[PDB]
Symmetry: C2
Subunit: 662 residues, 2 copies
Amino acid sequence: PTRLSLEAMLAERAMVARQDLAGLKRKLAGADRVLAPQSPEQCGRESAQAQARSVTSELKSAVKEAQGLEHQTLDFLEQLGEYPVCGILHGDHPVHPSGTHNNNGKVSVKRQFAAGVNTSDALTCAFRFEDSDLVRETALKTTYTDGTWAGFVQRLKMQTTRKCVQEKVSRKLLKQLFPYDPQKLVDVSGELSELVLGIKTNAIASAGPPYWRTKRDALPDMLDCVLPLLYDHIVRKDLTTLRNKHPELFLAECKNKTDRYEVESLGEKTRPYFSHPFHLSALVSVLSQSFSGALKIMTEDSTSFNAYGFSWTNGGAEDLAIWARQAGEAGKKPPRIACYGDDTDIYYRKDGKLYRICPDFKQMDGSVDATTIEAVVDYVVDAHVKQYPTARQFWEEVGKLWVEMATQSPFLIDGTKVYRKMQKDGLMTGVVGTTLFDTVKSALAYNDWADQLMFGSLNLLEEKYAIEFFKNKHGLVIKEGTWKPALVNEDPGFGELWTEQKFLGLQLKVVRRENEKVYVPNLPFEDWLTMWVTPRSKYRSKETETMRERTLFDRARGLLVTGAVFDERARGLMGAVINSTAPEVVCMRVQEGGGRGAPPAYAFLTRDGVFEFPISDGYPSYDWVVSLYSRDHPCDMPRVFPEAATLIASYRKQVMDTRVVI
Amino acid sequence: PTRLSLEAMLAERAMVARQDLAGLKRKLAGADRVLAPQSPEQCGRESAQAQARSVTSELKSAVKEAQGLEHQTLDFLEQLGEYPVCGILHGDHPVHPSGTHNNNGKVSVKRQFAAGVNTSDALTCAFRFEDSDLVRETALKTTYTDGTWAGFVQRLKMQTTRKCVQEKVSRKLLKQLFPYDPQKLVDVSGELSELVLGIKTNAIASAGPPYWRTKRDALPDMLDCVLPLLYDHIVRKDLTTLRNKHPELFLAECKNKTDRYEVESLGEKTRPYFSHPFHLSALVSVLSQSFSGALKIMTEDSTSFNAYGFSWTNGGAEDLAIWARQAGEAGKKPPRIACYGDDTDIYYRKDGKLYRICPDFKQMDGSVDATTIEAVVDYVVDAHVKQYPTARQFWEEVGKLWVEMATQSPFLIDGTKVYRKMQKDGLMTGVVGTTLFDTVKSALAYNDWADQLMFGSLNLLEEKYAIEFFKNKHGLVIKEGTWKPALVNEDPGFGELWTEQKFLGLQLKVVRRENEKVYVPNLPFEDWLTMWVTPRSKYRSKETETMRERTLFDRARGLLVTGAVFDERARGLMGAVINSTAPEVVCMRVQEGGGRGAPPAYAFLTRDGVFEFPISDGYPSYDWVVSLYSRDHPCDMPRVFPEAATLIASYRKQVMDTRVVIK
Ligand SMILES: [Lu+3]
Ligand SMILES: [Lu+3]
């Protein structure tokens, strides 16, 4: 009687079983568990939480004080009038949801500066498996918060009133610094709906005005209502009429970015970003995302300054080293320069010796000139149009909107007053293409820096003159103390570092796989600990104690994969967290990661950004994590409970050989 | 940002949308619907419902009375004692559940003859769109019931006490009549757990004793405890010890089969079958299923008598015709004989003209001799051992268990008394390989029938001498009136039939597609109508009104695919049901068919029985069904609501050309 195989029955049985924790607990009672390397227990649960709770209160006290500070006035921004709420309807309901973002018919919004900080669950784990003096110091240094009004306004002022230097950039120069594969460019000559449906974005992210919902809840309304309307006005050159009738259709929202902030500067620093209308962002994302997918990176073309698209896993970390060594003698041969937004990696040789530099830009978004922004939008639009000339007219018009969004969009801050930057200079952070805009601006400066080296200006290898140079000739602010070129260990031994410097937030280290060197990311334990005790997520009301224990497990796997596994103390910490996780929590059915578990928070592991754990009940072992960064990857992810898929099915392994003699 | 494409978001949005009937009805309020050809409404909703209940009540009354009849005694079966309940444990529970099949320590089981019949749902639809006199007359003829104590004991006695004729069969003849492909044989040389986990079965089916639960709920106990225990006593040749300590591990249960039955013969016909212990049936299923997966069929090898594995779709119906035409002159050239269980199709030529014969056996299981059973088991075991000799002894030991289960396997009927068939002859229906055993028995007989035609015995073409032949030489009972050779239409025109005869329960018919001929299955409206108004499912109170209405939709698609679409009246009745189905029910999310919808009941559409609909919200059109039975590229299944996927996600696509000139 055929229907469903026995193996399928067991599988179907297990899937049902791991949805019942209480039952899952009994099924894994005496199950052979594989413990991961962990740190020894330092104190009990009670003390660990009490100490962790004490730190959190002291952090809220600091945040509370800073948030009480008076903030500067917004008289540095052009003040437009008040915008009326969009009366557009999508059949039965209005595109602008009634009862939200409305003040007597005028569009409104309210900035959120909460006192709440973190969950402190991860902090309890730290106090439990590490020295307290070290844990408390690290925890009190940084915190996850909404920031402060004072820091928000001050930071907004800085990136909207800075004197910029217009760049001398041409298509010839951009084709040289940022080469791409025309064949990888998306066919923009196709129908618009298909193109837009192809762009990727965060479903939870705000749709901006006039939707005031998630991009998921507002997707339909913008797709067969707002988009069509926008399109018809674009082709008829009648954008101005649509702007006057529905001002909110082009309104942006200036927001304070909740993030990890230094506690001793919460009152003078809170990064602002701009959230544009879904239909505008999604439309340009057709070009922006198309172009990034065609862009060659530093390790694919040694003439390219582009690091935007670089990833560590799959030999990627080794690629950096192999490419970095191509650096020539300062003054005689060209250096190696990789640009990834505000982040940059510089290599040069002095007397044959390889040196590395990892400078920081002090809020370079306020240094991005309109000439560079507009020259990039042209480079992108011209690239597509040069490939599919049948649609030149339309996308050139889109480039105009793209430039407006990046520099001169009207936005709300707090309340009902609408604002706008006095000057076109300065990049409005958050706009589609922010990473590219920063990269090109950064690359053009360093490309100039390289040219000066050839004249023999080897004094530009020094912080003093470097800082002076980037400020006068490019208007970029190199943070003092970040220009410290270090001698590079070109052939690291087992366990040795490339340099103690960072790129994309990580160090380059060499480890032993099996008689072979593997290049992998690494960080000091203090840095791993800082990220751990400072999860980017505030206390949610309905997050049960179970889903909370699972978050520790998933965050622990993530950090290990990012490189925490290559540090002793950090490895042990995540190891202690994983081993202290209940069996039913390790083998439960999770939703994140397509059921395979939430992926690492780090965004530069794979170029497509998509990292997926093999199984949800597996722990990151040293041999498995190394295989992610090696060019081979001949390794499966080990299970915390070997022989668990059977136990969940209420049966156990048993070999019954049919070859036996009777 | 970048988490997932917008196209993906609409997909997720569409997924949750098809899980809310209220919202789903709302979105599909004024959507465009492609209506299937239907019969006009014959009478109102209340009137159709009134006539339906009245009929089902008659059928209940008929079944209730038939169940009150007295049945014969079980004196014809060997009288064994009582078996003790198996007190084997798994950890937190015993293999034999507490307070279930137990009577003061002794194994027990009660036979179920309830007076529940049908549901009246499909029948109400029939009265609504069809002739009252026809629907009434058709529905009153048969019902889906448990049967009766009388017909159950009668049919059991007949198949357990018939005088059989031992077949002269050898491995040589079996290779000649049943050729297979050694490469397609499962490597039973490596491990048992992996092999046993390879066999497929019904999860809702009883695991038998001592589990007394569904195979799904007893699987863990069977695999992790009982099976390993059985293995040890097999390798040590100590099965006689395990029998005398845990008799229930070898005990079977004789059950009455709930099914469609003729009402006027409820007291005479209720087919019995045997359900062996899970660990046994699964163990032998390894060899059985492996062999049928490697078996050649008539249309793949002319010398083969095998029809076990034949399917209709994908040119199957035309394959049968192309194979049948090869039949030679009776006496001179060999005929064309295909055997599938007790069902058999025969073709021969008399003065050039082709004739077809579709005879019926009377409970063939009672006629299956023990020698044929042994010969078949040895044939299957030898085939696997010839391929993988490194495990010969083990599976040969299994062949011993296989033969036992098919003949001398002890069993319970009702109460607590253990019975057994006194003779090794007669096949215990239900045993793994029942289809194969019947097929081989039928082939050995017809193969001999074929040889007699060569000896000049052309009188065996006549029913009078055919019946006498199968009886005297093979103990096979040909049901009188079923041996009636019909002149075959070798090249049927558009809309014409192969013959009015049935094979595998369907007729062979030729239909038109543009200009080419297509061979497809077919039945009279009366036969489609009988299957429709007689669903093989009893009334279940824990089944909502939405579930019932969805089932009408599914069964309507299933019959159309099976061939109801090629009958004008049947096509119209099924179309009426589909069109009368609520949009929220059509585009609803279903669980059956892996989310694609419940597959057709007919299990001879494809070789592996699995027919999967492309979509759950589509309807079987004439064009789509025909492409299923043809050999080339089945068309896309037409959606009931062509604008469905869009309207669900609250989306309406609008062409925006990027290649447009700007003002
Ligand atoms: Lu200390
Ligand atoms: Lu009439």
